[PDB]
Design a protein around this ligand. Structure first.
Ligand SMILES: CCCN[C@H]1CCc2nc(N)sc2C1
Lengths: 58, 272, 231, 225, 337
């Protein structure tokens, strides 16, 4: 079992290694852009008035 | 001095309010068994708000009553009904402990329809019995002489009221606690630590406090009313009344300060 | 899911009759029951309703007190103790299922019913009684109510029922454009406040029948006059 | 303000609440106990005998004795990270532990079976989720122990052992060693019993232990003890 | 054997070097140049009652109104959050339920636990009562999590260290996911349903392909077992929660940690993690009886959702983001807005 496990591990590592690589800064910028784009329509971040809030006094 | 009564009232209100708020706040304390303690605390709060201030007024005035006879009758009725309710609540707590010891299967976790039903029935029975015992006073049955003196002096009512309020519940509680002691000792012997000794000490101290608090007062109460020739003095009556009133002040300490959950709740509250 | 009503026949005005309905194939205990009458060549009319567990009972103003209704969950049978009878009581009685919860479709299943012969409320009206039309052509049916059916919750309590010849009414749309299960997508409902209309993309030979508009905003339930389609 | 349909939904919700309350009341009256041990420790024999007196996953066994309902859960077949689901049994009334008394001279692929059983008992007893949960210990292979002890000395399992090789002394030593693993004796107690072909006494002992545990829990609730 | 082990070590070192070489900048440095969000105040609006046991799992509906909660008493309750009315009560054949799921269409629900079997119930039966439709047996460990890919297939996680995709109509798993050294604890589905990630006790999170059935990517860095995992709303990133009192944000593309959410005074574990609709805020549950809101782009604490009397086990945000619901072991479920 040791030989088979070591093999499967080495092919898995080899396949994972060969992947396209981009920069972290671009990913962070994309995340910030996505957050700011939809920030105006987030009820939790910007509480809505009672006229639209469905959770109110019964 | 009346300042002693004022301090006693302050201690009573502080302790009962603290216990009630601790029970209300901490979630685990909301259980069927603690409802009896809550009722006892409510009765103590009512006693603190209603009766002792008027007793302090009498002490300051030296027994001189200037209000209408209706006020005196209401005062006597309230005092009697509070005292009977407290004694019967103690008896109900004892009988609940007995039921837990003897019939534990349903008592487990102190929750369910069976537990709530019996607790409500006992509380209602206690309150109804106190109200029924105290009602005859409102009907003018408490015959009195000089209107300026507010007290209970009717031979016919006194003996029956004292019997029902103390001797029946007192004997029931004593027998119940003796039976519980026998049950625990027999179980220990059949099976064959400091925890069982602690429980025994709890039972013994509760019984001793109940005795030393109530038995002398009722004994003096009956002797003064029915003894044709006894060396009774007003000072002794006042001392017995104070010893019976301090029972309510000392009850919450004995009934809550020695319980782990109550101790934790009190420590958390005082930490703020 | 089947409902079989029992009882009927000729009954004198001074007599009494007891109708029984057998429920099978579904959890009768959790389903509320309704009774709807239909006199010969007349429209529908709600009679009574029982909620799950028999905790709530309603009767129409013209039947209140006179008629007694009972439920028997263990036997899955519904009874109607029909104490007194008048001439106007002659009509066919239909048993209707009803379950009330979010997303539910009450009045979805209607029983076969039985025929019995005897020897303020929101007004529902339908201007069109008969609308001849050939197969394939689109057909529109309009219904109106005297009071707005739009509740503060944001939904309108309107129902559409189709009764084919020799067949009991079948639910089509409920509150107020959703398609009932098992119905073709041809039917579509629309409206606003008080004006509602039912539209069919293309009529087929199976669409021949009478369409009834019903409101469920408040009891007693009221049924429209009914519009018949023929070719 | 609620509509007729909303009122019907509210009534249905109230009926569901009543049904849930009834189910909870019915379920709160059944004693729930957990059973632990090795496959050869006698768990199967215990379960079979108790069932007679009255696929992967956990086995549920129901039995009644003296108008008292019992619920037994077996997790032996569930070999996995136990600490990730042991907390599910916080409300267990008691824990049943079975260990074979004759496995002291056998070997397991700790190396010795008895050492592994003691380690498991120590781990379960000291588990943070079983602070007030009592433990019941059953010895299932004492009859084989009678023969085995007369031939194989007990010193193999316990080098520090120096007492007599007689049966009673060995049994007492094993019981004391098993009991000594408890660190919170004040908070919890261990009930020990010896099981053999006879099965009448096992159910009575279990019932007595459950009754004692319930009595102690109710004393805790009332504040006594 | 030795040569293969050396090759594996060399490959791991090369992967680590490649990941490090692209760590030119950190998320915190870039996000330092924006205004932080103010104190978040949330008041409980509804307190759902009816459960008599611990709450272990819950899932919000697509309509953002209906939700289902699982308890140890063997009852599944579907709550109408707007009115708090109970819609359905499903008695479980096994009371040891550890997870529950709600179908995107709302026709079916799933649950599982120590029974090692996932049961599917039909909420739209012509019979009128909720009954189990199919049972997914075959797992050798307790079910940890389950999520509905679509009406036809469901993906489930088990404690046997393997995850499988089950076809409801067929009843036989079509794909099996293997590679986790520890028991799999949680699952999360991407917004597009193209990919999903799983967490295991080996302190590593792996990326799996629905159709290929292979692990494309692996994540490491946690000091303890991972209990919670949730995808970022954009779908390009996810966050994980472990017992070491820290939440780590992992993005699929960078294959490295972007930011760490932790506080010195917190020493307890983390049960559940969820994201806001826009992803601006991060919500995580803790064993200290309250939920903490974390600034996703700055890691600063935004608020605390206290009020639970026991461990907070599960929580979820509505699809529209209107409100967030939290579950706890005290048998009470609260909705915050
Ligand atoms: C210490 C409080 C003084 N009031 C007592 C006076 C007479 C009496 N009789 C009862 N049956 S109770 C009661 C209360």
């Amino acid at each position: 079992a040791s030989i088979a496990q070591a093999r499967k591990l080495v092919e898995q590592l080899k396949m994972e290694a060969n992947i396209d690589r981009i920069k972290v800064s671009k990913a962070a910028a994309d995340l910030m852009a996505y957050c700011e784009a939809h920030a105006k329509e987030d009820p939790l971040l910007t509480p809505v008035p009672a006229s639209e809030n469905p959770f109110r006094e019964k | 001095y009346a300042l002693s009564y004022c301090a006693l009232i302050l201690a009573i209100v502080f302790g009962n309010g603290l216990v009630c708020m601790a029970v209300l706040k901490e979630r685990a304390l909301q259980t069927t068994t603690n409802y009896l303690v809550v009722s006892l605390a409510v009765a103590d709060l009512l006693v603190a708000t209603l009766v002792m201030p008027w007793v302090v007024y009498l002490e300051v005035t030296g027994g001189v009553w200037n209000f209408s006879r209706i006020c005196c009758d209401v005062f006597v009725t309230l005092d009697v009904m509070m005292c009977t309710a407290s004694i019967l609540n103690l008896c109900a707590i004892s009988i609940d402990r007995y039921t837990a010891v003897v019939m534990p299967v349903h008592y487990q976790h102190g929750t369910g329809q069976s537990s709530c039903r019996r607790v409500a029935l006992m509380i209602t029975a206690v309150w109804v019995l106190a109200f029924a015992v105290s009602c005859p006073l409102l009907f003018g049955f408490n015959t009195t002489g000089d209107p300026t003196v507010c007290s209970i002096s009717n031979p016919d009512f006194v003996i029956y009221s004292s019997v029902v309020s103390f001797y029946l519940p007192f004997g029931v509680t004593v027998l119940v606690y003796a039976r519980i002691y026998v049950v625990l000792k027999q179980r220990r012997r059949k099976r064959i630590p400091l925890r069982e000794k602690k429980a025994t000490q709890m039972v013994a101290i509760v019984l001793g406090a109940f005795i030393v608090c109530w038995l002398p007062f009722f004994l003096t109460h009956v002797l003064n009313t029915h003894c044709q020739t006894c060396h009774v003095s007003p000072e002794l009556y006042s001392a017995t009344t104070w010893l019976g009133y301090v029972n309510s002040a000392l009850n919450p300490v004995i009934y809550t300060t020695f319980n782990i959950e109550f101790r934790k709740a009190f420590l958390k509250i005082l930490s703020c | 899911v089947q409902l079989v009503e029992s009882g009927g026949g000729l009954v004198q005005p001074g007599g009494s009759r007891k109708l029984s309905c057998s429920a099978s194939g579904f959890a009768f205990s959790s389903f509320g029951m309704h009774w709807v009458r239909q006199a010969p060549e007349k429209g529908l009319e709600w009679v009574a309703y029982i909620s799950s567990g028999s905790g709530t009972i309603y009767y129409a103003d013209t039947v209140k007190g006179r008629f007694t209704i009972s439920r028997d969950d263990p036997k899955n049978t519904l009874f109607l103790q029909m104490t007194s009878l008048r001439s106007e009581d002659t009509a066919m009685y239909y048993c209707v299922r009803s379950i009330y919860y979010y997303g539910s479709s009450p009045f979805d299943f209607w029983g076969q019913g039985t025929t019995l012969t005897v020897s303020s409320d929101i007004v529902m009206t339908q201007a069109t009684s008969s609308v001849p039309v050939t197969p394939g052509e689109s057909v529109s049916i309009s219904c109106r109510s005297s009071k707005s059916l739009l509740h503060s919750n944001g939904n309108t309590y309107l129902y559409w029922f189709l009764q084919r010849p020799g067949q009991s009414p079948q639910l089509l749309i409920y509150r107020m454009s959703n398609l009932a299960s098992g119905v073709p997508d041809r039917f579509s409902g629309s409206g606003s406040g008080t004006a509602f209309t039912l539209t069919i993309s293309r009529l087929e030979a199976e669409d021949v029948g009478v369409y009834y508009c019903m409101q469920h905003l408040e009891y007693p339930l009221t049924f429209g006059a009914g519009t018949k389609l023929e070719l | 303000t609620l509509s007729a349909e909303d009122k019907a939904a509210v009534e249905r919700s109230k009926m569901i609440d009543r049904n849930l309350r009834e189910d909870g009341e019915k379920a709160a009256r059944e004693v729930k106990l957990l059973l632990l041990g090795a496959g050869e420790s006698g768990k199967n024999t215990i379960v079979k005998q108790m069932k007679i007196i009255h696929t992967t996953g956990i086995v549920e066994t129901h039995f009644t004795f003296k108008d008292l309902h019992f619920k037994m859960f077996d997790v032996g077949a569930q070999r996995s990270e136990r600490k990730k689901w042991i907390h599910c049994f916080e409300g267990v009334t008691a824990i049943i532990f079975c260990v074979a008394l004759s496995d002291y001279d056998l070997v397991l692929a700790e190396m010795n079976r008895m050492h592994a059983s003691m380690k498991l008992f120590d781990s379960i007893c000291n588990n943070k989720w079983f602070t007030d949960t009592s433990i019941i210990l059953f010895l299932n292979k004492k009859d084989l122990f009678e023969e085995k002890i007369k031939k194989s000395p007990l010193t193999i399992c316990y080098p520090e052992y120096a007492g007599s090789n007689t049966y009673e002394e060995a049994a007492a030593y094993i019981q004391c060693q098993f009991e000594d693993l408890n660190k919170r004796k004040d908070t919890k107690e261990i009930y020990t019993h010896f099981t053999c072909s006879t099965d009448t006494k096992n159910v009575q002992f279990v019932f007595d232990a459950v009754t004692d545990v319930i009595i102690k829990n109710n004393l805790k609730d009332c504040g006594l003890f | 054997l030795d040569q293969l082990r050396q090759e594996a070590e060399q490959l791991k070192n090369q992967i680590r070097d490649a990941r490090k070489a692209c760590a030119d900048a950190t998320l915190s440095q870039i996000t330092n140049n924006i205004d932080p969000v103010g104190r978040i105040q949330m008041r409980t609006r509804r307190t759902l009652r009816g459960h008599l046991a611990k709450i272990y799992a819950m899932h919000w509906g697509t309509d953002s109104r209906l939700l289902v909660s699982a308890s140890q008493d063997g009852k599944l309750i579907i709550w109408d959050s707007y009115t708090t009315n109970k819609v359905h009560a499903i008695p479980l054949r096994s009371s040891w339920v550890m997870t529950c799921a709600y179908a995107p269409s709302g026709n079916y629900v799933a649950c599982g636990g120590l029974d090692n079997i996932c049961s599917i119930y039909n909420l739209k039966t012509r019979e009128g009562n909720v009954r189990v439709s199919r049972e997914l047996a075959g797992h050798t460990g307790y079910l940890s999590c389950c999520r509905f890919l679509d009406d036809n297939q469901i993906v489930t996680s088990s404690g046997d260290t393997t995850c499988a995709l089950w076809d409801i109509e067929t009843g036989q798993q079509t794909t099996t996911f293997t590679g986790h050294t520890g028991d799999v604890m949680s699952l999360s589905l991407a917004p597009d349903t193209r990919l999903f990630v799983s967490g295991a006790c080996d302190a590593s999170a792996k990326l799996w392909d629905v159709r290929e059935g292979m692990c494309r990517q692996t994540f490491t860095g946690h000091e303890s077992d991972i209990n919670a995992i949730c995808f970022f709303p954009n779908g390009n990133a996810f966050a994980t929660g472990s017992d070491d009192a820290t939440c780590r944000l992992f993005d699929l593309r960078a294959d490295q940690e972007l930011m760490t959410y932790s506080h010195d005074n917190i020493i307890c574990g983390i049960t559940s993690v969820s994201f806001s609709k826009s992803g601006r805020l991060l919500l995580a549950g803790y064993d200290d009886f309250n939920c903490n809101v974390w600034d996703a782009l700055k890691a600063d604490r935004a608020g605390v959702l206290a009020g639970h009397d026991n461990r907070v086990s599960c929580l979820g945000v509505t699809d529209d983001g209107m409100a967030v619901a939290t579950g706890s072991w005290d048998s009470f479920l609260k909705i915050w807005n």
